[model samples]
Target: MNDIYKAAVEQLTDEQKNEFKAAFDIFIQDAEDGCISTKELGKVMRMLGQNPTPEELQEMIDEVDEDGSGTVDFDEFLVMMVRCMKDDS
Candidate 1:
């Protein structure tokens, strides 16, 4: 993780930590959830207070789309949470 991410997590509220704890389940709920073939993750991100741009989403998909296959694993999802979610300024 970068300094920005480390600083962000370090400064998280108890509520925010708990929120991420709950979401960590969502992060690795099901392999199918990881491979959801639509815009479901994008929708979930919106609900999580991280509204990603289409370009950003595409970039993320590209990063994890190894073998030219179209699936994102739990690790990728976790990274998304780390990168996309923010701590308050």
Candidate 2:
């Protein structure tokens, strides 16, 4: 893994990692096609009590969208989750 990801993983407890993993898996299942589109991601954010504008959400997707797919795979979602945790602390 890259240094950024390595550090993020190191900062998480095992329980938190598993919890996030489970959550991500549920998100994937919700999408039903193995990736999270902006629409589905917006739903997730709303479910988590966030109310991001379209611009804000697009910016967030751009930040970690390594493949330029405009959607998030598991690893990208995990990276985003880690960044959110870091921002909270």
Candidate 3:
């Protein structure tokens, strides 16, 4: 996860964080708790383009929920957005 987010976030340089927060805002539309869930994942994934498979869906939770909150937070999304984005796999 740190592999890409090291660049995706740490190197986000404030500029990308602003842009990325804008992105998270849009994706967080359905998340009252301010993060994504399994079913929530499908919708966001759809917006990202294409339907996601069930197995593939949970896999993202693994990559995305590394914090183990069992919920996909923005930081989680930030990390896994690397390497084909946990989809296209």
Candidate 4:
């Protein structure tokens, strides 16, 4: 894990960690071959009650897609979440 991710995980309470894991599982439920497609990601975004524009969502995917596959794995998803939460704060 990256240092920032390690720090973020270390900062979370056990309950928060469990909650995140559950949510992560939900995010990955329809993931094929263990990655989230843009369609699946949009579903997750909507489920979170956010109506993100296609461009905005694409931008977010681009931001965390280190491998440039236009999809997100669990680690990338966590990075996206951490970055989003960090930006919000």
Candidate 5:
């Protein structure tokens, strides 16, 4: 299973981890029921307690542009992977 969500949930503390599972349950249900759009990216952001507006997310994307190509490449992806993996709460 490419269960990245479950992997991310593992980063939560005992209390918050359970809450995330519960929230994830509902989020998945909503997705299955067509009550929402995609889950991976937005779910990750929401789990971080930030509902980044499209513009805000774009700003983050812009900030990571090293070559001024307005995009993040493999190195940036690795950086983001490590950063996002750490427990922030």
Candidate 6:
């Protein structure tokens, strides 16, 4: 069912693989609940245990939500995917 992401999936390490899946599940759940906020990104940050109360993190999320929609949609999440893929591919 998730074959659509196979192309980039292979490049992710195990941890990233889970986070990507987690993001997708959270995306679906939040969309169903009429929720769309940067919180999803923050939750993922929590998984990595580096959600500092620093502007640096704020800037990171700002960059992620380039649409300024306060939510990271599929493409916006893809931005993160591409980022980690490059980092540890």
Number of residue pairs clashing in candidate 3, backbone atoms closer than 3 angstroms, sequence gap of 3 or more or interchain: 0
TM-score, one value per model: 0.46, 0.65, 0.57, 0.61, 0.32, 0.52
Residues 1-89 of candidate 1 have per-residue lDDT tens digits of 35655755565577865665455556446655444432455765675678778887786666544444555554455455455444334
Worst 10 residues of 3 by lDDT: 80-89
2 or 4, which is superior by lDDT? Answer: 2
Candidate 6, 14-75: lDDT as tens digits: 88656666656665774754434675566666665556565655656676565786766656
List candidate 1 stretches off by more than 4 Å: 1-21, 24-38, 64-68, 81-89
lDDT of 5: 0.46
> Which candidate wins on TM-score?
2
Cα lDDT of candidate 3 equals 0.63
Question: Per-residue lDDT tens digits of candidate 4, residues 1-89?
Answer: 34566667666677855655666687667777777775466666676456888888887877777788766777676666555644434
Worst ten in a row by lDDT for model 4: 80-89
Give the best candidate by lDDT: 2
Q: State the RMSD for candidate 3.
A: 4.8
Question: Which candidate would rank higher by lDDT, 4 or 6?
Answer: 4
The per-candidate count of clashes, in order, stands at 0, 0, 0, 0, 0, 0
Query: Could you give the candidate ranking by lDDT, starting with the highest?
Result: 2, 4, 3, 6, 1, 5
Alpha-carbon lDDT of model 4: 0.67
- Name every residue pair that clashes in candidate 4: none
Deviation of model 1 at 75, angstroms: 0.8
Task: State in Å the error of residue 78, model 3.
Answer: 1.9
lDDT score at residue 78, model 6, on the 0-100 scale:
55
